């Protein structure tokens, strides 16, 4: 499949209460594989996956110093923005960045990108053509004009088309086994009619990974996806997730109701009724 | 590896 390498960055100011908290988290095919947290005991770029340990400390030196550079720069950026937006010197604010490359199974680059947000709203972004920027508002327009004059995008292209891709197809080797793995769920229905006449039926899936799963209810043939109740997929802890779906039915009719559980770990979908 | 961010 198409893999990606993405870095998520947060800088969040906390006036009076210390120094801007800084964070870089890295994902490969969308699982956390490195982190830096200005707030940890002895800040440093720690591996977040066992397979990253197979990396020599010369690598943990560079990344760490980079982050301290970056951290210090976002310190300054948080300040710049106060003057662009005319905001007051003592409120809290947030800058976030997403950067990465997306690579085909054939290894060719599909999409390089980099997007910035201030206080949860898109601020500036690099366009698909990898040469120009789209600014979301009047402050980002300053940033953008500034970045054009400095040819900042050619530097970004180079990183996105070179380093990023080359380091992607390298974390992929050392991380594969752990990454393109998977684990099947296990279900069970449950009756939870609080001493009443109506009978709501609930389907429980657990133990599964990845979080891609789908559960449904049908009236044997036709689909009862109308009044079906289900909550967002949650993570359990060990590196696997859980989910449940539910729906109302006339008491007496209970075994005319089937649950369906789909997941790539399974060799066939799962089916179950009351136990 | 990550990137070295330009200033805003």
């Amino acid at each position: 499949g198409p893999h990606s390498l993405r870095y998520f960055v947060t800088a969040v100011s906390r006036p009076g209460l210390g120094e801007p908290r800084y964070m870089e988290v890295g994902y490969v095919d969308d699982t956390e594989f490195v982190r830096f947290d200005s707030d940890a005991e002895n800040p440093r770029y720690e591996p977040r996956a066992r397979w990253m340990e197979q990396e020599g400390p010369e690598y943990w030196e560079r990344e760490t110093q980079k982050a301290k550079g970056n951290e210090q720069s976002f310190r300054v950026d948080l300040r710049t923005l106060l003057g662009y937006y005319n905001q007051s010197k003592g409120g809290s604010h947030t800058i976030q960045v997403i950067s990465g490359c997306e690579v085909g199974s054939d290894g060719r680059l599909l999409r390089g990108y980099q997007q910035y947000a201030y206080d949860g709203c898109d601020y500036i972004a690099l366009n698909e053509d990898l040469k120009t920027w789209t600014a979301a508002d009047m402050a980002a327009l300053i940033t953008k004009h500034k970045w054009e004059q400095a040819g900042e995008a050619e530097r970004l292209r180079a990183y996105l088309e070179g380093t990023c891709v080359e380091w992607l197809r390298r974390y992929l080797k050392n991380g594969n086994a752990t990454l393109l793995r998977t684990d099947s769920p296990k279900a069970h229905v449950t009756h939870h009619s609080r001493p009443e006449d109506k009978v709501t039926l609930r389907c429980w899936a657990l133990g599964f990974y990845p979080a891609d799963i789908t559960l449904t209810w049908q009236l044997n043939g036709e689909e009862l996806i109308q009044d079906m109740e289900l909550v967002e997929t949650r993570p359990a802890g060990d590196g696997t997730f859980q989910k449940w779906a539910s729906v109302v039915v006339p008491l007496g009719k209970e075994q005319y109701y089937t649950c369906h559980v789909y997941h790539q770990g399974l060799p066939e979908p799962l089916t179950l009724r009351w136990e | 590896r990550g990137y070295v961010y330009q200033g805003l």
């Epitope: 560079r62 110093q65 980079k66 301290k68 550079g69 210090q72 720069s73 310190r75 300054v76 300040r79 500034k146 400095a150 040819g151 050619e154 530097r155 292209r157 180079a158 990183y159 070179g162 380093t163 | 590896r1 070295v4 961010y5 330009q6 200033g7």
Partner: T-cell receptor
């Protein structure tokens, strides 16, 4: 060393063309190389720069670079040397990213004498 | 039409006497300000880069002890203590911290006398 200027001095005639060597080391993916010159009164004037990811020898006025990535080398060519071209020439490079801030790393510099 | 103004321009001073230096930014599109030292054989070496007002810092080099303050968005200061040999101090400015060109002030020349 990180930035190296092997030659101490050069003496040449007016109207000649001089090359100043510089060789460098860095483990950065992207980097930037500069030449500055310093005059008798000690002012340090910027001359020309070369970005590593840019695939063409920079040039400005009679100053031009001979940029040779594989050889970690970045010569400064002055064509048609003038008397006022006489100074010390500094080769510099941006000193690897990390807390530090605005770090230029300099070589020891080269004296250029242009004889009338 | 220069970006930076540096004072004082020189100083004659016995071994060890403290000296203060100050640099004023004239163009605020280059707010990244650094101090560089050139020693008596002309070797330039970086000392500090101070972006924000209130940024304070110390750095001991062979022959001198430094303390630097970004005082306001245009004023940068330098304390040189314990100076045992002369050297000259250059203020610089640049438009950002990655890759932009550094431009040099005229230097404050220190002479142990």
């Amino acid at each position: 060393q990180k930035v190296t200027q092997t030659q101490t001095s050069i003496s040449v005639m007016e109207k000649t063309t001089v090359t100043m060597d510089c060789v460098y080391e860095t483990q950065d993916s992207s980097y930037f190389l500069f030449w500055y010159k310093q005059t008798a009164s000690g002012e340090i004037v910027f001359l020309i720069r070369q970005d590593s990811y840019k695939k063409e020898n920079a040039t400005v006025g009679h100053y031009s670079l001979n940029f040779q990535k594989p050889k970690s080398s970045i010569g400064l060519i002055i064509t048609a040397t003038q008397i006022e071209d006489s100074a010390v020439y500094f080769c510099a490079m941006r000193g690897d990213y990390g807390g530090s801030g605005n770090k230029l790393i300099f070589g020891t510099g080269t004296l250029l004498s242009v004889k009338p | 039409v220069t970006l930076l103004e540096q004072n004082p321009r020189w100083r004659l001073v016995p071994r060890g006497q403290a000296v203060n230096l100050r640099c004023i930014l004239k163009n605020s599109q280059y707010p990244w300000m650094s101090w560089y030292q050139q020693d008596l054989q002309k070797q330039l070496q970086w000392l500090f880069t101070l972006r924000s007002p209130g940024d304070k810092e110390v750095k001991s080099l062979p022959g001198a002890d430094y303390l630097a303050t970004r005082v306001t968005d245009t004023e940068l200061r330098l304390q040189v203590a314990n100076m045992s040999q002369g050297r000259t101090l250059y203020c610089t400015c640049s438009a950002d911290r990655v890759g932009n060109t550094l431009y040099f002030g005229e230097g404050s020349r220190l002479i142990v006398v």
